[PDB]
Design an enzyme around this catalytic site. Structure first.
Site, PDB file in Angstrom:
ATOM      1  N   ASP A  53      -7.093   1.016  -1.487  1.00 13.97           N
ATOM      2  CA  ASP A  53      -6.111   1.343  -2.497  1.00 13.97           C
ATOM      3  C   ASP A  53      -5.243   0.091  -2.631  1.00 13.97           C
ATOM      4  OD1 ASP A  53      -4.513   4.606  -2.999  1.00 13.97           O
ATOM      5  OD2 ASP A  53      -5.133   3.045  -4.403  1.00 13.97           O
ATOM      6  N   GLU A  54      -4.567  -0.066  -3.765  1.00 11.71           N
ATOM      7  CA  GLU A  54      -3.737  -1.244  -3.966  1.00 11.71           C
ATOM      8  C   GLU A  54      -2.726  -1.451  -2.836  1.00 11.71           C
ATOM      9  OE1 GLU A  54      -3.408   1.478  -6.381  1.00 11.71           O
ATOM     10  OE2 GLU A  54      -1.830   2.203  -5.043  1.00 11.71           O
ATOM     11  N   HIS A  69      -8.031  -2.895 -14.290  1.00  3.31           N
ATOM     12  CA  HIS A  69      -7.799  -1.538 -14.755  1.00  3.31           C
ATOM     13  C   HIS A  69      -7.207  -1.674 -16.153  1.00  3.31           C
ATOM     14  CE1 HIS A  69      -7.352   0.167 -10.368  1.00  3.31           C
ATOM     15  NE2 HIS A  69      -8.164  -0.873 -10.406  1.00  3.31           N
ATOM     16  N   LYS A 117      -9.418   8.049  -0.292  1.00  3.42           N
ATOM     17  CA  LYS A 117      -8.266   8.935  -0.184  1.00  3.42           C
ATOM     18  C   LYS A 117      -8.295   9.577   1.205  1.00  3.42           C
ATOM     19  CE  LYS A 117      -7.168   8.008  -4.372  1.00  3.42           C
ATOM     20  NZ  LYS A 117      -5.944   7.237  -4.744  1.00  3.42           N
ATOM     21  N   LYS A 141      -4.555   7.790   0.147  1.00  7.00           N
ATOM     22  CA  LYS A 141      -4.208   6.404  -0.160  1.00  7.00           C
ATOM     23  C   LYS A 141      -4.041   5.668   1.168  1.00  7.00           C
ATOM     24  CE  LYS A 141      -1.317   5.484  -3.662  1.00  7.00           C
ATOM     25  NZ  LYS A 141      -2.242   5.061  -4.757  1.00  7.00           N
ATOM     26  N   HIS A 187      -6.250  -5.149  -9.631  1.00 10.67           N
ATOM     27  CA  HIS A 187      -5.582  -3.867  -9.832  1.00 10.67           C
ATOM     28  C   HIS A 187      -4.224  -4.195 -10.471  1.00 10.67           C
ATOM     29  CE1 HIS A 187      -2.619  -0.866  -8.714  1.00 10.67           C
ATOM     30  NE2 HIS A 187      -3.576   0.002  -8.444  1.00 10.67           N
ATOM     31  N   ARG A 188      -3.952  -3.631 -11.645  1.00 11.31           N
ATOM     32  CA  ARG A 188      -2.715  -3.897 -12.383  1.00 11.31           C
ATOM     33  C   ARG A 188      -1.413  -3.325 -11.823  1.00 11.31           C
ATOM     34  NH1 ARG A 188      -4.383   0.240 -16.667  1.00 11.31           N
ATOM     35  NH2 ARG A 188      -3.083  -0.781 -18.259  1.00 11.31           N
ATOM     36  N   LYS A 235      -4.931  10.595 -15.885  1.00 12.97           N
ATOM     37  CA  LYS A 235      -3.542  10.962 -15.630  1.00 12.97           C
ATOM     38  C   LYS A 235      -2.522   9.920 -16.089  1.00 12.97           C
ATOM     39  CE  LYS A 235      -3.749   9.480 -10.778  1.00 12.97           C
ATOM     40  NZ  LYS A 235      -3.663   9.993  -9.382  1.00 12.97           N
ATOM     41  N   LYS A 280     -13.331   1.525  -2.828  1.00  8.48           N
ATOM     42  CA  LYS A 280     -12.293   0.510  -2.743  1.00  8.48           C
ATOM     43  C   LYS A 280     -11.069   0.841  -1.916  1.00  8.48           C
ATOM     44  CE  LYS A 280      -9.428  -0.007  -6.258  1.00  8.48           C
ATOM     45  NZ  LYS A 280      -8.208   0.730  -5.769  1.00  8.48           N
ATOM     46  N   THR A 299     -11.665   5.025  -5.118  1.00 14.42           N
ATOM     47  CA  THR A 299     -10.607   4.571  -4.230  1.00 14.42           C
ATOM     48  C   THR A 299     -10.503   5.584  -3.103  1.00 14.42           C
ATOM     49  OG1 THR A 299      -9.307   3.518  -5.985  1.00 14.42           O
ATOM     50  CG2 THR A 299      -8.169   4.078  -3.948  1.00 14.42           C
ATOM     51  N   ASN A 338      13.669 -16.495 -20.961  1.00 15.04           N
ATOM     52  CA  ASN A 338      15.043 -16.016 -21.094  1.00 15.04           C
ATOM     53  C   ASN A 338      15.268 -15.093 -22.280  1.00 15.04           C
ATOM     54  OD1 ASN A 338      16.388 -17.709 -18.919  1.00 15.04           O
ATOM     55  ND2 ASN A 338      15.490 -19.322 -20.197  1.00 15.04           N
ATOM     56  N   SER A 351      -9.524   4.214 -14.217  1.00 19.35           N
ATOM     57  CA  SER A 351      -9.237   4.942 -12.987  1.00 19.35           C
ATOM     58  C   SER A 351      -7.969   5.775 -13.006  1.00 19.35           C
ATOM     59  CB  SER A 351      -9.153   3.959 -11.817  1.00 19.35           C
ATOM     60  OG  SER A 351      -8.619   4.584 -10.661  1.00 19.35           O
TER      61      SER A 351
END
Lengths: 473, 138, 473, 138, 138, 246
Positions: A199-200, A322, A171, A173, A289-290, A329, A197, A169, A119, A374
């Site tokens: 993609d998320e 990650h 592509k 996506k 994957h975050r 980027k 992989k 990853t 809280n 990544s």
């Protein structure tokens, strides 16, 4: 007639007076420590603010309650013991708070977080609040599993050492079909990548249900292994709406022989811990994957700093995560980033105000989490990547692979060769940071795949002003 | 085809001079150095034949290079690799492993597809050379 | 060579050029819409930022990939179709983005959020970002369950209508044993409260394991029922580390006959969705504590606004969710909060810039979620409570009950009387907001507990500047 | 004990005047008004006896007050309540229910504790009056 | 029969002097002193009614004996017990609880034998007095 | 823990005699253990009996009685004033009395004793058996009939004990441990393992009760040494004391 008259007689009193502020408190090796970046509302005493955060996140409430007497209140109450002004900011302060071990449930990230970030982040009296770092005690850290596989066991299962791992990853996506998905997987793995992989956001959708992707992808992974003599793998995403569904996808992944699977941070702590146990129980590598992290980790004035998530996730038992790149980027200050990598890899942490690590912290021998870099990176930055990120990391090139003009295999080879040349040079004790561009140039002379890659994204850069920056630089 | 196990297998086979430098790196990392070989490069063959005992407190790369060649001489047509083992508490494992010899020609692997339940397949990878007794491979 | 020459030939190009920016795009009723508050890096074109968020959260990547050619690319690309500057903040702009229905896995919050909030918040080119609102289409909404119980069925199972419900979070937060916990539960329920609850951080600790709490608490609940002639209940917290452990506690709650249980948002979306189904399949009221929410819902420049969470959690299936007390100790602008309640309660949603609702939205007959006001409130604010929060809500007085000098039963009675008194007045068509203090002092003439509660917290007020405010006031 | 079911049971028994006001309120919200009663106040007795059909298009509260008193006259020693039903699509349920008659004295409830597995208990709440036949309650 | 809950129920009802010494004992052990009562002596009725708030920093036993006689007066035909609570970290519970008042005659308990699976039985213990409404007990 | 500490060293030729006198189990290691399933505090709360020692009785003769008869003794002793009555350590399931009858009849006596006194009563139903499956079956039946407590013998082994401690924690049951066989290695001063060590291991395992000795009874019990055992089981913290053996 039975009404009280003392510290516990009905009525409201400041938190700093309820026992939540104690500059003389001696931290116990069993305490859970937290460091917050407090921004009190104008007019509010910072000490009283720190104390309010300490009170509301442990055993207090806005007014005095006699029921405290029925407990060991003096022990359970958290203590704000130190308040420093943030270097160059008259509106912020760093508040150190100590919590008794008995307050938490063994091995539960959920309970840990329920108290710490329950809280306190919505208190009116506190204009802004951010959890910067935590000191999890040895005795508490021992109630957790830690990485299911761990960096050491992972490399042994993969038979790959002394060099970063390479992944990609797929592509686009979303949108690709099963058959085609596997096509990409085969080409990239055979070309030189260690992993490919989902993609998320690739789970099970109208354009591609998950079972086909799993089947085709496993055929692609096995062909690649047979075509290279390496142990290959593809992150099969088991992310789903319910635990039952996630188990269904993870178990199918287990039945088909997959060495690794993935999950998104967005599923939540409990599902994550459940999967971490599943992976340890099923000899599977668990990649995390975050997803959504930057939603509360980007700004410096409010939220939670990613290094805390790194601690929690390494405790939960996740194998990869990650942790950011520095020249990609996405957001990522080099020194703060070094912090994230140390937190996930080192057996012991040392206080470093520059890195944002405010606490010395033993890791109780829990296994190491493999950092993943990544987003936006490409061969040619290899020298910087190795220099900043180091050896233990998965370098993931998404468009940096598939984007190559000569095909997926070519894109992959380019990265694999770029990577090896750079560390062969590191080992030779060369100032590879400086000699970098030349090292790649000298290697590309023998591999057309690399030459091309080097020209395509020659000046591709991501120079911007960081948001999550140090205070002692 | 070319077997890509090993840290630098995507780069040209290393020269004794380059290998010499890697041994320097290993020496600095206080690693234990081992030499292993086999003519069954199945990627899941975790235990290659060991060449003598690992070298521990190494100070001279030439000494290590000596055995690498000694082995090359005794196992011309076998894969040979150099492994660096760390004993630091958190690691206690190999932290580098590279190829230092390959047979003159690698036929590659065979991929069996045993059809199981529904569309599932139980895969098996096996080197074509492994289908022959050890004394006749490569 | 079979290289490319067109739009898919290797290389990096701006997002606004890759098909992610279209001011002419026609929104489809099946589209998922998003409204982002964007703060582009100095030197970045707002439009290019919008397009970037559009691309990065859909199918895009930093570099073109020909594999798009293997899919109906033009369809899977998200499109920012509108971008306007925020009223008095030139650094910010509101960006509307449409996503194709086929992009999402049905009935999955994880997949939904993985796309929408997966990576776009950590983009360098964008200094700050905040998801302000979403427009979920009927077709997508029909794939979700909705509240397991719903305000209507809940009220029918409790037999309590035309008035807010009353609850109380046991205090102190931590430290109490099971036996003592039950004592508090009996006293408060018996005095007038409809509900009593575990604090979000009360799971199972050394000072008190969960099974004892459940047994003692249920004895207390039934005694209060027999002593009042009302259907009573206590929120048994089933929040735990793993999913299995959570089921084990939920099942025991079901075994002992509890009418309600609670979970913390901190367990995660997948765990939440899993529990929502269980509550539906087992006739249990599922209370959700927004634990951790303010970690990203506090600041106006970055994160996700709470109403987005309200939408995801109503879809998920939760029965109760903390939605704030306007006059409490936690953040809560009256107009912005009114939007929170509407999101959870109404069957159809209307665009209102003052409330922060940017879209019109049909709820597809999904059940209603019971909002919960909790935090620093007490009898005496009852008129402000009814006026701001309304009829459908659970007023939770934790300290405002247990802190009464005449005991817990008295504290509860005070709140219960004040509530009925104020509702009775509202119903009698009186201007209770203005006559509020009178209505209470009036009813207080007949109830000592009320009088006592009125003098105790007469001056207590939590007036502070709001951090999350409307941009059209 | 005092049965606290009903929206205003913590406040004194309402007067006909106050009840008239509550009826205005129900009328303002286009509710269908019903009258029900029982001498079994078990909190789980969802189906009290109905006093005729629910009054629908009520314009004058006197018409409702008349039946409330007619019921009172007929079932003086029974709990009597008034219910307000809403047919608005999303609702379609009761939105107000309050007591308008209580017997003279209320004995309260009995609590049965049946010991099941381990420490578990299966409870049963029953009003002491319900242990008697209806014609003999209160 | 005689209800033997309480630390000294096998001994004669304690005199006010004996009660006084028991208070000195409690005081010596820094305990909170609570007074409780009910007319439902089921051994599983964990929450008797409380007499005011618990007496914390008691120093004068007469202050406690005062309330005990006060409660006795207000609840003649009820069971009344005195409880000692400890806040020491590993205890945080009752460390003494004894009876200080019993109704003149205790009817005892009824035992229900519900026949379940095979020879299994689900038992139910209920005080006879609890079959009547509270204000009519003892 | 035991495998390392006492696995082989006690049979080493070079050491004529060896005895594990005490151990200091680290705090970080103690957190990985469950501890008493019920614990003294919660136990007294489920019994509603505080401020005084509890009273029990092991049915005699040790062996030979029938189920029906076993229930007679239980009822009589409970109603007479004892808090508990218990199966002897060697009472399991035998020709003169199979376990299921004993469970059925004893539970009737217990409930009668509770009705006749107004106290929560209980009888240690011994679930000790050859296999884990069988033990669960016996434990579960006791759970079914509503028993507030069960017992096990130290002779079943550390792993079976830990399995039972978890079970008792998950099924709200008091777990009593009879030291069966202990004196086999804890009696002599020159060789073996001191009982305070077992006390620690057993407190870690999660047992609720454990015979720790009577000083003036028929079994070995030095008053100061015994005091050491008691503290080890009750105290939240232990203090070095050579006179006691800690």
């Amino acid at each position: 007639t039975r009404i009280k008259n003392s510290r516990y007689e009905s009525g409201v009193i400041p938190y700093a007076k309820m026992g939540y502020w104690n500059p003389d408190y001696q931290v116990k090796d069993t305490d859970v420590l937290a460091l917050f970046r407090v921004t009190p509302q104008p007019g509010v005493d910072p000490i009283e603010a720190a104390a309010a955060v300490a009170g509301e996140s442990s055993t207090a409430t806005w007014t005095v309650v006699w029921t405290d007497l029925l407990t060991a209140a003096d022990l359970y109450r958290a203590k704000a013991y130190k308040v420093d002004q943030v270097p160059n900011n008259p509106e912020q302060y760093f508040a150190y708070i100590a919590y008794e071990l008995d307050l938490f449930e063994e091995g539960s990230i959920a309970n840990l977080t329920a108290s710490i970030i329950g809280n306190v982040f919505g208190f009116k009296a506190v204009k802004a609040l951010r959890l910067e770092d935590m000191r999890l005690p040895l005795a508490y850290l021992k109630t957790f599993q830690g990485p299911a596989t761990g960096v050491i066991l992972e490399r042994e299962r993969l038979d790959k050492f002394g060099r970063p791992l390479l992944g990609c990853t797929t592509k686009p996506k979303l949108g690709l079909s099963g058959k085609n998905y596997g096509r990409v997987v085969y080409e990239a793995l055979k070309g030189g990548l260690d992993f490919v992989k989902d993609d998320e956001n690739i789970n099970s959708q109208p354009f591609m249900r998950w079972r086909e992707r799993y089947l085709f992808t496993m055929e692609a992974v096995n062909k690649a292994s047979a075509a290279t003599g390496e142990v290959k793998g593809h992150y099969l995403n088991v992310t789903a709406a319910t635990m039952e569904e996630m188990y269904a996808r993870a178990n199918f992944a287990k039945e088909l022989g997959s060495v690794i699977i993935m999950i998104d941070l967005v599923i939540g702590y409990t599902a994550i811990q459940t999967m971490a146990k599943w992976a340890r129980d099923n000899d599977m590598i668990l990649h995390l994957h975050r997803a959504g992290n930057s939603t509360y980790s980007r700004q410096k004035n409010h939220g939670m700093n990613f290094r805390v998530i790194c601690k929690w996730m390494r405790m939960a038992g996740v194998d990869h995560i990650h942790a950011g790149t520095v020249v990609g980027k996405l957001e990522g200050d080099p020194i703060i980033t070094r912090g994230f990598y140390k937190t996930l890899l080192l057996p012991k942490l040392e206080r470093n105000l520059q890195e944002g690590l405010f606490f010395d912290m033993e890791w109780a021998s829990l296994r190491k989490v493999m950092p993943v870099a990544s987003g936006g990176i490409h061969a040619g930055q290899m020298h910087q990547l190795i220099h900043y990120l180091g050896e233990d990391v998965v370098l993931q090139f998404g468009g940096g692979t598939i984007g190559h003009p000569d095909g997926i295999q070519a894109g992959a080879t380019a990265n694999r060769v770029a990577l090896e040349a750079m560390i062969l040079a590191r080992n030779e004790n060369r100032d590879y940071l400086t000699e970098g561009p030349e090292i790649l140039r000298e290697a590309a002379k023998t591999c057309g795949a690399l030459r091309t890659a080097l020209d395509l994204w020659k000046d591709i850069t991501f120079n911007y002003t960081s948001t999550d920056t140090s205070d002692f630089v | 085809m070319r077997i890509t196990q090993g840290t630098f297998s995507f780069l040209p086979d290393l020269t004794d001079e380059q290998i010499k430098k890697q041994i320097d790196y290993m020496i600095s990392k206080k690693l234990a150095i081992g030499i292993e070989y086999t003519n069954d490069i199945h990627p899941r063959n975790a235990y290659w034949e060991i060449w003598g005992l690992p070298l521990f407190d190494v100070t001279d790369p030439a000494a290590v290079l000596f055995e690498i060649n000694a082995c090359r001489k005794a196992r011309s047509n076998f894969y040979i690799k150099v492994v660096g083992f760390s004993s630091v508490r958190g690691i206690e494992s190999t932290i580098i492993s590279f190829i230092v010899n390959r047979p003159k020609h690698e036929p590659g692997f065979n991929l069996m597809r045993q059809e199981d339940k529904s569309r599932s397949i139980k895969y098996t990878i096996h080197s074509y050379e492994s289908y022959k007794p050890e004394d006749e491979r490569y």
